[PDB]
Amino acid sequence: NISFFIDNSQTTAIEEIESELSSEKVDYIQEIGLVSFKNLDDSDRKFIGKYFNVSEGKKLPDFKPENINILNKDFKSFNWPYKKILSHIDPVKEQLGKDITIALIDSGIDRLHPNLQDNNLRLKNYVNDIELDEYGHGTQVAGVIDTIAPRVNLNSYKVMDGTDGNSINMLKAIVDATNDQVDIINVSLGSYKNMEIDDERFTVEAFRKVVNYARKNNILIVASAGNESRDISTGKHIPGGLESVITVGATKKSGDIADYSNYGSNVSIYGPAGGYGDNYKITGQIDAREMMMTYYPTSLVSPLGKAADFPDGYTLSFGTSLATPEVSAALAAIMSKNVDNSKDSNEVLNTLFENADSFIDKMLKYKEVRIK
């Protein structure tokens, strides 16, 4: 792709280009003055070239993923992350998340999952006409949300088929979710690559603009810190780690930062999201008890879920992608309790941090999400 920022003085140029080129070659985001072109031929480049300098176009990066009651004691080996953050709260009794809408910008969601029939699911697909959650990631994220804040509404923004997506679709989905009036945007996806530095400056600015657009509309964005076991504050991971993003790392069952989790001063908060266990680095084996139970598409087979004797629709997983929705659900719980005593997003955000508990990693001090 080649991407440009378009000034308000140049909007007629984009109109003329959109009229000339096939719609599937042009993605224009009015709200942030961004256009991105793909699959161009020589004729298309020549036409664009009479308004912009094609050689100055920047490349936006690709990104990657980062009745049964999970809270039942049948799953005590695997539901430990939820018990840690909920303590004794019964999310169903408290109707947590009622009338709050979370955008899941992810791989889609299994609309047939038996536990996702009460979330007023709304689906949008940016990539194809396949209505499935093709590889299961968005459904895993939705399961974390639904376990903690079961009464939320879910808007799914499917921005990837398989495991590699184009960031233009993530940017579009953030703006579309804002325009859809969601309350919280969850992004359990990220890019972190030795980008060419000018492409990276461009991409960081594009994300600053979409994040600011959401925040100005009083919407909080929660994003994964990533799973590279890196300090993302030493120079960019995108969007987790950027200004104005609530960036979520993962802790493992011992309470320490998980072996894969990114960390650093631009990671806002952590949530328990499990992992393979301490013996994995030695034997290559996964300790299922160190993993986290969540949903999985009924259209797929989970090997660890089957080995744990789960019904279809459930898996054992890990990742900052699972800690992120714990925070989105925490925010939704704060918001659902403030219907008649309205708090704005700034105050909700500060409440999230006040409610978190501090921990020391095996040696800095960090915050871990708690539901109240």
Task: Look up the CATH number of the domain holding residue 268.
Answer: 3.40.50.200
- Identify the sign of the CA torsion 263, 59, 220, 92: negative
What's the rounded Cα separation, in Å, for the pair 98 and 151? 4
What's the first-to-final CA gap in the chain, in angstroms? Answer: 44
**CA dist list (Å): 346 to 334, 338, 351, 371:** 12, 13, 9, 18
DSSP label at residue 304: H
Residues 242 and 213 in one domain: yes
State the number of CA atoms in the 13 A half-sphere of 164 facing the CB: 2
Number of Cβ within a 10 Å radius of residue 36? 24
> Across the beta sheet with 34-37, what order do the strands follow?
2-5, 34-37, 26-29
| Residues 25 and 116 placed together within one structural domain of the fold | no
CA-derived radius of gyration, the chain: 21
Continuous H helices in the chain: 11-20, 42-48, 80-86, 137-148, 167-179, 197-216, 280-283, 303-307, 320-336, 345-355
CB proximity list for 21: less than 8 A, separation 6 or greater = 37, 40, 44, 47, 48
Strands (E), 46-183: 62-65, 101-106, 122-125, 153-158, 165-166
Tally of domains within the chain: 2
Rounded-to-10 torsion of CA 128, 163, 252, 281 = 160
User: How far apart are the C-alpha atoms of 144 and 88, rounded to whole Å?
Assistant: 17
Looking at the structure, tell me whether residues 330 and 216 fall in a common domain. Answer: yes
35 phi and psi, to 5 degrees?
Answer: -125, 145
Write the CB contacts of 344 (distance below 8 Å, at least 6 apart in sequence): 218
Q: Are residues 116 and 206 in the same domain?
A: yes
Same-domain check for residues 162 and 32: no
Instruction: Provide the resolution (angstroms).
Output: 1.3
Single out the residue of 222, 6, 192 nearest to residue 105, CA to CA. Answer: 222
List CB contacts of 351: < 8 A, sequence separation 6 or more.
Answer: 334, 343
Contacts of 129 (CB under 8 A, 6+ apart): none
Statement to judge: residues 42 and 84 lie in one domain: no
User: Phi and psi of 20, rounded to 5°?
Assistant: -80, -45
One domain for residues 157 and 68: yes
Are residues 141 and 325 in contact, defined by beta-carbon separation less than 8 angstroms?
Answer: yes
Burial 248-274 (b: 16+ CB within 10 A, else e): bbbbbbeebbbbbbbbbebbbbbbbbb
Separation in Å, CA 80 to CA 226, 230, 289: 22, 25, 9
Residues 124 and 25 in one domain: no
Cα(359)–Cα(370) distance, integer angstroms: 12
How many Å apart are CA 231 and CA 257, to the nearest integer?
A: 12
225 and 126, same domain (yes or no): yes
Angle, helix 345-355 to helix 320-336, in steps of 10 degrees? 120
Give me the domain span that covers residue 193.
62-368
Q: Are residues 164 and 16 in the same domain?
A: no
Distances (CA, A) of 114 to 92, 139, 296, 312: 16, 12, 11, 10
Residue 199 and residue 202: Cα distance in Å, rounded?
5
Same-domain status, 70 and 52:
no
Q: Is the Cβ–Cβ distance between 349 and 220 less than 8 Å?
A: yes
